[PDB]
Structures are given as structure tokens and as C-alpha cells.
């Protein structure tokens, strides 16, 4: 008789601390080095493929971003690394990073018209100044928030007290428009000393415009710093402002919550149990090395390039 | 002769990488999975057990929390996760989490009368009582601060400076009463436009009342934002204010500055070397599954139900 062990013509190679490039009979390739190179649906739910559109451009509806006026349920927001149509009017949403962290757990919005445009009696809806946001010509503004201009040369105090009678959280976005100088104020808002006094049960703000000369950005020398809040059930948002108010028109009733993310990467159609911003991955491997960010039940990111468990005899 | 090994009738279970249930001989368990279940004395020192009371409710003396007006040496600050009596009047202690972090290393506060009520000649300190905090059903505001109001149809500008004159780091809490409207101001503080100007060696602050309409919380619509400062030795606090002043009336000398923590689980007459929010681990063993948060000569938390170390055989 003779004791021994089998062999084969395989060429898969593993590594050890003491030896390297050791040939083995059969070893499991635990590292998923392959990706389909496309973005698809996660568990039968299509993502939100914001094409050349940012979360600022989505939630504050950009006229160039009109494919998302009524969005279905999703599984992970998708955005480009440096989207172009992103706050076409210059400025920056305050706590923007907080909001995009908060949207990493909401799988669905319902756009509900909390505040129709008929609820601005003494204020004008002739707001054709945002030339930085062209869409089919003669652009006016975003659609989800209304930039109120004075009517009959007057700007009465905007005292609204919407109460979230709905039993679900609402995401209300408003803003303040920082003018170039006093000339734009008196040409837009007859009151020079303007303010906003948003008054949720938990929130308390007194904003003022920081009017000052500023540089060209997107062919506009003004700014608009936007703000957001989560109005809870039975709570009541209290807007009070006599100027420089990007009032809200739509809220986003948070009907579903779960696990989502924002991949920040540049759409396929095949089944994908897991996704990566570079491209989707479909395998049961323990590990992967495509990108840090993932979503769903996935393998575990490892920076290494060759993880191969030797399940065979050299 | 005959070589061999020790065999017993034990049923101890240990795990190896290649076989997950090995019947081992008297392997010592190094994970203590059990506890007393109650709050014990850390090194023979009484934990501060804030019963239905908070750090904000404790430091700013809450009428529902009168069992800690004079406090002995402690180790913990045990609090309820959902504290019922916590800032009864609506408000928000600014940098409250920073204050909790500072209190996570202060083992003692000697309450000291830095500012007696006789040092308020032209201002009323008796009628400043809020229905949000009832004392056995009667109105009564916090006692560690005084909610001043106008007296003799006037609110003269407080301008008071307290030199530390101690070898310890006394803590000073004050606040600003963010009122509801101009009428509440004129009823309380005769000056409509008010400012709280605080000054230390390392702290310049100017605060203004955000007189903004807001929701009703705890039966009251106003707000009171509280602010804390630690005053280093030989330093001097300087309070200037013509309104909305929740002036300080007690302070908290740091007699002892050691190691502590704040635990949010809701008293046992016992002794524990190391405590935990749910129970108290007394046995000496490297690991423990009880809770993440511990302080003292404690074991190492591990999120696993089995770490029996196979000191023995089979």
C-alpha cells in the first residue's frame, strides 16, 4: 500500500506568511474582484438615478431636473460625483450634510402640497430673475419652494402655522435670500430690515439677510442659504417673515423608513442583490474590493487584491 | 506502562475554528454573563441616583427634584433615559452635551452661594414662578437660578461681576428667556430690545431674545436657553443684562475632580467594584456581556455569548 494525496492540473495560487505563490488543488476565491459595471434595481426596487442632479437640486426642485416630480419608492439614492445642476441659484443649504445623512434611512417620499400658491394672498408669483436656472427658456425658480416677491410694492408679514395633522414626519425646506446690496432689497422686499422666525416646538431661529457685495457665481451675485426641518406628528411649523423668504410649497411626507445611502457615482436592468457605486455585484463571496460604499446585504470591503482561502492540499 | 490524559464528567463547551462544540475538561469560563440587577455602591460611595430627574434638572434645581439640594460624594450620575422631570419650562440648555461630558469627570460639586438673593436690589426674584414646574401644586421656578422680572415698573441694567477667589473651578449656569411675543416682554421686562452680554477671560457672548411665536410644550409657549461656564481660578465672570436674564443664584465648586460617567438606565444596598446601567458586575473575570458603558476597575465588553477559554483538554 502507499499513503499519499491527490493532485491536479490547477494553477490557482494562495499566499501564506512564510511562503507565497503556493499552488493549491482547489481554493475558494473569497474576494469578489468582478462587478457588472452598471447600476440596477435592489431587490426589485429601482434606485433614484439623479442624472446631472444633486440632492439639493432634487429636494429643492431644479427646473433642469424635471424627471423626478413624482418619484416612486426607491432603495438607494444615486448621484454623480460633481453634478452640474446643483443649486443653480448660488448658495448652500444649511446642514446640507445633515440632511443627506438623514436621507440615508428614508426609502420613500410622498410629495404633498402642504402650502399651495393660493395661500400667498398679498405676495407676487412673478419671480423671473433666476437666469442661472434655464429650462425651456425664461426661467423663474425651483418648483418645490417659492421665492416670494413683493406685491403692489408691499411685503406683509408671512405668518403661517401649518400643523402636521398627518401621522408621519414631514421634511419642510425653506430659505433666506441674501441680496447683493440694499438696492436689490428695496426692489424685491420693501422692508430693508427683514427676518425669518421659524418656530417648531424644538427649533428656534431668527435669520437675517447678510447683504454684502459678492463674486460672480453662475452669473448671479446674490445667494440663497436654505434650511430644513423634520416636523413631527401633531407638531406645528410657524413661519414668520417680512422679507427674504423662500417659502415652502411642498413637504415630503416620510411614509417609509429603512436603509438607503447616496453612492455619489455615475443604469442597468439585471438583478442585483448588492450594489457598489462603481458597479453592481452579484455573488455570495464573503469579501469584495470594489469601493467603500455599499448598500444592502453585501460582502465586506477589503482593500487587498488576493484573498483566497486554501481549501485544498498544495 | 500507559500514557494518557485526564478525563472528567464535565459538560463545559468551548469553540474551536474547526469544530464549534467541544466537550472540554474543566475549562474556566472567562466571560461573566450574570449580574446583581441593581445599583450598588462603587467603592463604598453612593451613586447619584437622579430619580425621574436629569442632569439639567439636577444642576438647574428642579422643584420635582429636591432630594439633591445638598449632595454627598458620588461616583455615578444615574439618570432615566426618558426623564419625566427635565426642564419643565420649555427650553434648550446650550452645549448641554458638553456639560454632561464635563460632568463625566467631576466626582463632587459643593453648592455655593456665590450670588445671594440680597444682591438683586432693584429686581424681583419672588414672583418669577412658572406653572410648568409646580412645587406640590403651587407655582415655583428653579432655585439654582432666578428668573428676574421688572420691579417698580422698571428693569435696571444688571451689571455684576463675580471674581472666583477660590482654588477650584466653579461652574456658573445662567440663561436667556426667549419670550413668546412683545407683550410678554413688556409684561416681564420693561425694555423691549434686550441683550445678555457675558464676559470671561476666554468667553465673549452676546445674546438677544428671539421673540418668535412657537408651539406649546409642557403647557407653556415661551423658551429658556441655558448656558454654562467653568470659571478657572482667579478668573472673573461679568454679567451685563437689561432683560430676559435667568440670573445665577447658586454655583457648583468642583471640590473633587476625578473619574465618573453618566448612565441612563433607571437603588440597591450593596457593594460593587464595577457597575453597569442594568446591573452591577462584582466577579473578577476579563470580559462581560452586560452593557457597553462601565467605569472603574471593570472588565472588557464583548458582544458575544461565549468566550470560554479551553484551559483544559478534550
Amino acid at each position, epitope marked *: 500500500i502507499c499513503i499519499g494525496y491527490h493532485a491536479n492540473n490547477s494553477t490557482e495560487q494562495v499566499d501564506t506568511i512564510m511562503e507565497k505563490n503556493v499552488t493549491v488543488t482547489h481554493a475558494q476565491d473569497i474576494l469578489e474582484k468582478t462587478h457588472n459595471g452598471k447600476l440596477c434595481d435592489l431587490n426589485g426596487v429601482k434606485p433614484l438615478i439623479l442624472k446631472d442632479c444633486s440632492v439639493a437640486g432634487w429636494l429643492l426642485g431644479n427646473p433642469m431636473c424635471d424627471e423626478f416630480i413624482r418619484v416612486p419608492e426607491w432603495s438607494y439614492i444615486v448621484e454623480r460625483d460633481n453634478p452640474a445642476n446643483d443649486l443653480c441659484y448660488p448658495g448652500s443649504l444649511n446642514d446640507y450634510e445633515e440632511l443627506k445623512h438623514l436621507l440615508s434611512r428614508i426609502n420613500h417620499f410622498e410629495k404633498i402640497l*402642504i*402650502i*399651495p400658491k*393660493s*395661500s400667498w*394672498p*398679498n405676495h407676487e408669483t412673478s419671480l423671473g430673475v433666476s437666469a442661472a436656472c434655464p429650462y425651456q427658456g425664461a426661467p423663474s425658480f425651483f418648483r418645490n419652494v417659492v421665492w416670494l416677491i413683493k*406685491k*403692489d*410694492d*408691499a*411685503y*406683509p*408679514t408671512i*405668518k*403661517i*402655522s*401649518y*400643523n*402636521n*395633522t*398627518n401621522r408621519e414626519d414631514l421634511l419642510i425646506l425653506w430659505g433666506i435670500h441674501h441680496s447683493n446690496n440694499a438696492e436689490e432689497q428695496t426692489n424685491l422686499y420693501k422692508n430693508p430690515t427683514t427676518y425669518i422666525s421659524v*418656530g417648531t416646538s424644538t427649533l428656534n431661529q431668527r435669520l437675517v439677510p447678510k447683504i454684502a457685495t459678492r463674486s460672480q457665481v453662475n452669473g448671479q451675485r446674490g445667494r440663497m442659504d436654505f434650511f430644513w426641518t423634520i416636523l413631527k406628528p401633531d407638531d*406645528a411649523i*410657524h413661519f414668520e417673515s*417680512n422679507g427674504n423668504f423662500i417659502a415652502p410649497e411642498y413637504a415630503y411626507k416620510i411614509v417609509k423608513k429603512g436603509d438607503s445611502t447616496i453612492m455619489k457615482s455615475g443604469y442597468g436592468h439585471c438583478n442585483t442583490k448588492c450594489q457598489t457605486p462603481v458597479g453592481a455585484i452579484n455573488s455570495s463571496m464573503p469579501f469584495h474590493n470594489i469601493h467603500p460604499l455599499t448598500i444592502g446585504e453585501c460582502p465586506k470591503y477589503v482593500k487587498s487584491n488576493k484573498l483566497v482561502l486554501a481549501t485544498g492540499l498544495r | 506502562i500507559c500514557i494518557g490524559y485526564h478525563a472528567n464528567n464535565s459538560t463545559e463547551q468551548v469553540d474551536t475554528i474547526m469544530e464549534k462544540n467541544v466537550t472540554v475538561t474543566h475549562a474556566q469560563d472567562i466571560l461573566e454573563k450574570t449580574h446583581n440587577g441593581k445599583l450598588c455602591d462603587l467603592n463604598g460611595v453612593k451613586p447619584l441616583i437622579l430619580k425621574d430627574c436629569s442632569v439639567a434638572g439636577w444642576l438647574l434645581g428642579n422643584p420635582m427634584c429636591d432630594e439633591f439640594i445638598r449632595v454627598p460624594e458620588w461616583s455615578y450620575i444615574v439618570e432615566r433615559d426618558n426623564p419625566a422631570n427635565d426642564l419643565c419650562y420649555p427650553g434648550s440648555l446650550n452645549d448641554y452635551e458638553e456639560l454632561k461630558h464635563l460632568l463625566s469627570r467631576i466626582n463632587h460639586f459643593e453648592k455655593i452661594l456665590i450670588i445671594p438673593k440680597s444682591s438683586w436690589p432693584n429686581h424681583e426674584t419672588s414672583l418669577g414662578v412658572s406653572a410648568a414646574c409646580p412645587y406640590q401644586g403651587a407655582p415655583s421656578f428653579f432655585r439654582n437660578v432666578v428668573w428676574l422680572i421688572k420691579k417698580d415698573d422698571a428693569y435696571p441694567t444688571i451689571k455684576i461681576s463675580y471674581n472666583n477667589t477660590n482654588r477650584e473651578d466653579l461652574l456658573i449656569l445662567w440663561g436667556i428667556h426667549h419670550s*413668546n*411675543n*412683545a*407683550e*410678554e416682554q*413688556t*409684561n416681564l421686562y420693561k425694555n423691549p430690545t434686550t441683550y445678555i452680554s457675558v464676559g470671561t477671560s476666554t468667553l465673549n457672548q452676546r445674546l438677544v431674545p428671539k421673540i418668535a*411665536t*412657537r*408651539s*406649546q410644550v409642557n403647557g407653556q*409657549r415661551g423658551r429658556m436657553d441655558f448656558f454654562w461656564t467653568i470659571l478657572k481660578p482667579d478668573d472673573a465672570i461679568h454679567f451685563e443684562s437689561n432683560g430676559n436674564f435667568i440670573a445665577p443664584e447658586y454655583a457648583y465648586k468642583i471640590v473633587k475632580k476625578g473619574d465618573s460617567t453618566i448612565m441612563k438606565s433607571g437603588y440597591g444596598h450593596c457593594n460593587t467594584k464595577c457597575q453597569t446601567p442594568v446591573g452591577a458586575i462584582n466577579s473578577s473575570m476579563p470580559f462581560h456581556n452586560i452593557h457597553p458603558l462601565t467605569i472603574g476597575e471593570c472588565p472588557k465588553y464583548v458582544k458575544s455569548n461565549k468566550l470560554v477559554l479551553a484551559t483544559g483538554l478534550r
Partner: antibody
Amino acid sequence: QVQLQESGPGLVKPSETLSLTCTVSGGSISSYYWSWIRQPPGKGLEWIGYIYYSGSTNYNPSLKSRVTISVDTAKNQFSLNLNSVTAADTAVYYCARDLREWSGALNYYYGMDVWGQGTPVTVSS
Amino acid sequence: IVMTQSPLSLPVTPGEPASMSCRSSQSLLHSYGSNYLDWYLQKPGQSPQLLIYLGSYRASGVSDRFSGSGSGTNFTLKISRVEAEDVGVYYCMQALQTPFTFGPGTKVDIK
């Protein structure tokens, strides 16, 4: 520049229905409350009632039982014809928009921006 | 709610500050903190015009001269500087509950 124009006769006798209709010229009858307020001679204003643009009705108890309520959104108008008229109901009847949004989730009250010029009704045998 | 204006007729002069008081018989502070009291002006032979709303906030097209204040049962209107156009009846109308009522009306006239 929204105008509220009163219509109908300015004459009526006792024990019948006085006719008057309010046409919303220059605006619309959408998303707004609409109220009628009377001014008797030598007396302060008295609020009769109002109707929501859907048609939700609320009355004054002083004239709850004998006020017809109606809104006709086809031509952008609303009409409330007082019935069982007595001699004491002689008053100048004014239209008015109302911005109460009193029910529902919204609540904002600017309040009675636009009024009609008024119709001098005269109840007389 | 029963309302009353303490000046039934406020004799004013041009170019001088003036004020009037309107008192209710019920806490007019509506939920959401707003008082829900309107001040209307009515010139001789003209429809009412909303001078003020929710106690203090001015209506469109109303000068800075008018301003109101009050939270409880008491309320006050204040004309910083009076003109001939201000002559007329001032109504203080509560809008808390469905049975709306108006004050007796203060006929501001030149002294």
C-alpha cells in the same frame, strides 16, 4: 386687483327672500373662504356666515335658521339669499374674501383682504 | 365673545401720535400663539379695509404709521403719526371661534 361685485335687487318686502349674488371678477373662487358681513344703519358690523370653496358652511346663531347658503363655482361666484326677512334686517351687505384656512392642517390668517363695495338692501313693505 | 372699545370716539389731530384700546371678554390667544384679532378701517361711504391682522402685523399697502400690540384680553392700536385719511370707524374683530363679532367701533375724527 381682485374685485368682488354684488348683484341682485336692492329691494325686498317682509316675509320673502331677498336676492343677492357675489361675482369674483378679476380673481377666482378657489382655495379661499368667502363670507358675508352686514352693516345696519347706525350700528357696528355683524358677521352673517361664510362658506368654504368646497362648500363647508358656518353660520351666525343670530341668523342660523333662516339664511340660505350656496356657492356657484362654475361662474366664480357665491350667493347667500336671506329668507324669512323681517323689517329689522335692513343693512348694507358686504362681500368679503376670508383667508382663515381654519380647518385642516394649514392654519394661516391674514384675514379679509378683499371686500365688496356693498349693496344697500332695504326691507320695506 | 363680547368685545368693547374703550374710546368710543377718539378725537385726534393731524401730525401727532395717537392710540386706542380694544378689550375682549375671552382669552383671544388662539393655538399657534397668534391672537387672531383684526383691525379694520372704514372711511365714510367706503368698504372696510384691513389695517392690521393677528394683533400687530400690517396689511399690504398700509403705511408704517399703524401698529398694534396685545396678547391677553387687552389690545391696543397705535398711529405713530395721524393724517386726514385716518378719519373713520375703527373695528376690532376677533377671529378665534366661529361666532365672529365686532367691537362697537371707534370713530376717529379730527379735533
